[PDB]
Amino acid sequence: KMHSTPKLKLKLTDVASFLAHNFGVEDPVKFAKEGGKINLDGHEILFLNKDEEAEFVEVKSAIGDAKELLKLLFYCIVDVSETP
Amino acid sequence: EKLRLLLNDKDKKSFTDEELNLFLEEADCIYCAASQGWILKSLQYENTVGEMYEYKVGQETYKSSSIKDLVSVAYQNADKFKDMCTNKKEKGSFMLGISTEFE
Amino acid sequence: EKLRLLLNDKDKKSFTDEELNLFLEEADCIYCAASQGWILKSLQYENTVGEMYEYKVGQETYKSSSIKDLVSVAYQNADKFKDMCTNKKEKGSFMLGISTEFE
Amino acid sequence: EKLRLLLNDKDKKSFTDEELNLFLEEADCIYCAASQGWILKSLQYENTVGEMYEYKVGQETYKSSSIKDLVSVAYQNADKFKDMCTNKKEKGSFMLGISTEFE
Amino acid sequence: EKLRLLLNDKDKKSFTDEELNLFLEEADCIYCAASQGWILKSLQYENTVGEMYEYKVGQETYKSSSIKDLVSVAYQNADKFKDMCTNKKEKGSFMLGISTEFE
Amino acid sequence: EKLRLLLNDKDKKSFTDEELNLFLEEADCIYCAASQGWILKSLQYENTVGEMYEYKVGQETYKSSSIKDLVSVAYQNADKFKDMCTNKKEKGSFMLGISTEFE
Amino acid sequence: EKLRLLLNDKDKKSFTDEELNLFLEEADCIYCAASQGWILKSLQYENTVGEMYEYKVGQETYKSSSIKDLVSVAYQNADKFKDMCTNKKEKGSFMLGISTEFE
Amino acid sequence: EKLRLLLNDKDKKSFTDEELNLFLEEADCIYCAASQGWILKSLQYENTVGEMYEYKVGQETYKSSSIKDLVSVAYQNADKFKDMCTNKKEKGSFMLGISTEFE
Amino acid sequence: EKLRLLLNDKDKKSFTDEELNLFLEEADCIYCAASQGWILKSLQYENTVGEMYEYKVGQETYKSSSIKDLVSVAYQNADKFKDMCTNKKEKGSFMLGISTEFE
Amino acid sequence: EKLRLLLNDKDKKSFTDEELNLFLEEADCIYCAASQGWILKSLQYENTVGEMYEYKVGQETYKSSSIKDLVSVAYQNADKFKDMCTNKKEKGSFMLGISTEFE
Question: Which chain C positions have a beta carbon within 8 Å of B70's beta carbon?
Fold first, then answer.
């Protein structure tokens, strides 16, 4: 839940002006305090200056190895119960 | 008054006001006209100061700034006004929605 | 008072008060106005130092820094005031929540 | 008037009107003509300053900027005019649709 | 006392005390106010020492530090005070726990 | 004694006694106080060497290092003291165990 | 005798023994104390030589080394002694066995 | 004989033989001792040349290489001796067998 | 004769002929001993030429090469002889067979 | 004749005849011997130009290029001769067959 969905990073030249122009977030600090949440339809197109960058901060696998541990513990459980 | 502010941006008593009106008309942004006027004023140093940057006569000795330095400074002023024109007219980045009709 | 503080920032008794009011009108932040006034002050060095920056008469000799040097110093003042304005209006990076409506 | 505007973009008194018309008709944009005229003006320094640029007679001393500095300044004027012409005719980037017939 | 320490940092007897109070009010960190005051004192060298950095009269010869050097040193002092302010206010890196409620 | 050691780390009788105590209070490590005091001492050179660093009267000639060189030396002293303080408080890298509770 | 060797590493009678013993106590390695003393002795060129590096009186002319050069050389000596201390205390790389208990 | 060879390497009759024996005891290799002695000898240029390196009296003029050049030469001698010692104790790369006991 | 060739590699009587035997003994390759001897000869310039590189007395004026230049040239000669020694002793690359016994 | 060709490859007869034979025997290629002889000749400038390269007596003035320039020129000659020898003995790249016995 924390990290499965990717997080979009924007290396903007001026974050405050970008927020004010795009999302109308005049006071971004208070927007953070209030817990406000930007709305995106999903279909977006990015017009950036030469120096600005945009990328997705994405994990190879948020679970890591937990499925393997779950398989091992499931084997241990069915062994302990001697359940066919 | 636009003309007075331009004369402040590009010093007075050198050009007559007709070319000032011309510069104002050729660019609505006053700083763009100021940059243009500063370049055109830089052109005039070949007459007002000339090449003879230093001379001694009798016991008099005067060392004026060379023409290259003067035109360089005028160009720098024009560049500053041009950058001002850009920044005034510049707008930050934008992320906008996109959508195509479909059935 | 804004005009007094600007006359402190932009060195005094070179511009009369009406263009100072114009500077205050052109930008809310006083430091941007100070940078603008400093550039416009730097324009003045044409008459003072471009015509003559080092002269000797008889045994009397006087040297002054060239026009390039003084305009460089004034430009440094202008850039410092501009950077001061940007740092005043700058704000740090942000991570915010995002949420789209769904059925 | 295009001739008077060009003669304002150039220092005048060294080009008769015939070559001014020649520059005007050779290049439609006036700034390209100004750059060409400035290069042609820069050519003249081989006579005035190339032959002699610093001389002293008796106690009379006279120094002028060398031919290299003056031709450099004139070339800078020419390049500024050329870049001005390019920015005049410059147009931004474009994204356009594309479509091919099919059945 | 704030004012005495500031007059020690920003060298004394160039400003009167009211603008020093304004400097302290601008930023609670004394070193930031010291940097601001050092810049605004750097602006004053054009009057106190002037651009006439060297002169000879009779058998007297005096070579003062050029205005560029003085303003550069004042800027360096202001930068040092700004860096001191940042280092005083700067905290090192951090690794913290994160947790989201679930079910 | 900390005051005596600090007045050994700087020139002994340029500063009044109370500001030495002030610097000792501001930073616990003596070398940080020495760096601060050295910067503050470096500020003095505008008064003496700034307004005059090289003069000749009659056959008497005297030359002294410019303000830039002296303030550079003082800044070098300040930076050396600061680095000395850092190396005093610096500690090497570490590898430590990690353990989380589990059932 | 450690004090005698330190008074050879750092030249005599710029300090008194009451601080040479202090420097010996500051660091067990004599070369580190020598570097510290060399920096502290470099501080003393403000008085022993002063900024007045060259002067002419009558037919006498003397050109002493500038204070910047002397402090630079003293810093270089201090750096050499510090590097000597490190190399004395430095040990080469190591590959060692590692083992964890297990059943 | 070690002492005579060192007195050949480190230039003669500036250090009494006691500290020569001290340096011989300090470092096993004579060239390391020579580098040490050269670094210590370079300190005398402070007194010898730092306070005066170029003087003219009447028509008599005498110039000597500045303290920086002489200390640079002495440091170069020290570094050459140190590198000579390292090359003496240097040994080439090696490939050796490896074997671990096994049942 | 080895000694004669070495005394050709270094101009005669900067060394007594006895220690040439030592230099030959410490390195069989004559050029290595030549490089060592050239460094040792470079050390001698502080006595033979001293620091006083230029002086004027009466109408006499003499400008000898500075000691830094002479020691630099001697070091360059020593480096050339060392490189000659290496190239004489150096051998090119090799590809050789390798084989391990096996049953 | 090899001796005459070597006395042409080197500036004639600063040496005596026996060392020419010595160099001819030391290296079979004449150009390598010429490079060696040129370095050995370059050693000679110690006395000729190192001791006094520029002197003035009365109105008589005489300047000669410093020892560094002449030893540099001689080194350039030596390097050119060495490169000539290498280019003589150099041979191009090769592709050759390879074959191993097998049954």
Answer: 46, 50, 67
- Helices and strands in chain F: count of H runs, count of E runs: 5, 2
CA atoms within 13 A on the CB side of D46: 3
Q: Classify residue J56 by burial, with Cβ atoms within 10 Å: 0-12, 13-18, 19+.
A: middle
Please enumerate in sequence order all residues whose Cβ is within 8 A of that of B58, keeping only pairs 6 or more positions apart, or say none.
D59
Taking the C-alpha atoms of residue H52 and residue H66, their distance in angstroms, rounded to an integer, is: 9
Could you tell me how many CB contacts below 8 A there are between chain A and chain B? 41
CB D39 within 8 A of CB D81: no
B69 touches chain D (CB under 8 A): no
Which chains touch A (3+ CB pairs under 8 A)? B, C, E
Is C61 in CB contact (< 8 Å) with chain E? Answer: yes
Residues of E in contact with F68 (CB under 8 A): 65, 69, 72-73
Helices (H), chain H: 2-9, 17-26, 30-41, 45, 67-89
**Run of H or E residues at A47:** strand A44-47
Q: Tell me the two tokens of residue A12.
A: 């903007």
Query: Which residue does chain B place closest to A48, by CA atoms?
Result: B93
**C97-98 and A37-38 beta bridge pairing:** parallel
| Resolution of this entry, Å | 3.4
Burial-class residue D5 by CB neighbours within 10 Å (0-12, 13-18, 19+).
Answer: middle
Q: CB C89: neighbour CB atoms within 10 A?
A: 14
Show which subunits contact J, needing at least 3 CB pairs below 8 angstroms: I
Bridge partner residues of C56 (DSSP): B61, C61
Contact I66 H69 (CB under 8 A): yes
Neighbours of H96 (CB within 10 A): 4
B-C contacts (CB, under 8 Å): 56
The experimental method is: cryo-EM
Touching status, chains H and I (3+ beta-carbon pairs under 8 Å): yes
**Residue B78 burial (CB count, 10 A):** 22
* Token pair of F56 as six digits: 């000749």
Tokens in use for J43? 């050693």
Q: Do chains H and G touch (3 or more CB pairs under 8 A)?
A: yes
Rounded distance between C-alpha atoms, residue H54 and residue H46, angstroms? 14
DSSP A14: -
Q: Which residues contact A63 (CB under 8 A, 6 or more apart)?
A: none
In C51-96, DSSP assigns E strands to 54-57, 60-63
Residues of E in contact with A2 (CB under 8 A): 98, 100
Of B8, B60, B70, the CB nearest to C67: B70
| Minimal C-alpha gap between H15 and chain G (Å) | 10
E46–C63 C-beta distance less than 8 A: no
Q: Which of A18, A39, A51 to mutate to test the interface with B (most CBs of B within 10 A)?
A: A18
Tally of CB atoms within 10 A around D95: 4
Range list of β-strands (E), chain E: 54-57, 60-63
Residue D71: partners with Cβ closer than 8 Å, 6 or more residues away? D42, D45
**H or E element, residue C76:** helix C67-89
Tell whether G14 lies on the interface with H, counting CB pairs under 8 A: no
The tokens 């005048």 sit on which residue?
Answer: D12
For residues B31 and B90, is the Cβ–Cβ distance under 8 A? Answer: no
State the angle between helix axes of E17-26 and E30-42 in degrees (0 to 180), rounded to the nearest 10: 130
Tell the residue number behind the tokens 């003056």, with chain if given.
Answer: D70
In the Cβ-directed half-sphere of F17, how many Cα atoms lie within 13 Å?
1
Residue with tokens 């600061």: F82
Residues of J in contact with I10 (CB under 8 A): 43
Residue B33, H or E segment? helix B30-42
In a 3-state reduction of DSSP, which class is residue G52? coil
- Cα of first residue to Cα of last residue in chain J, in angstroms, is 57
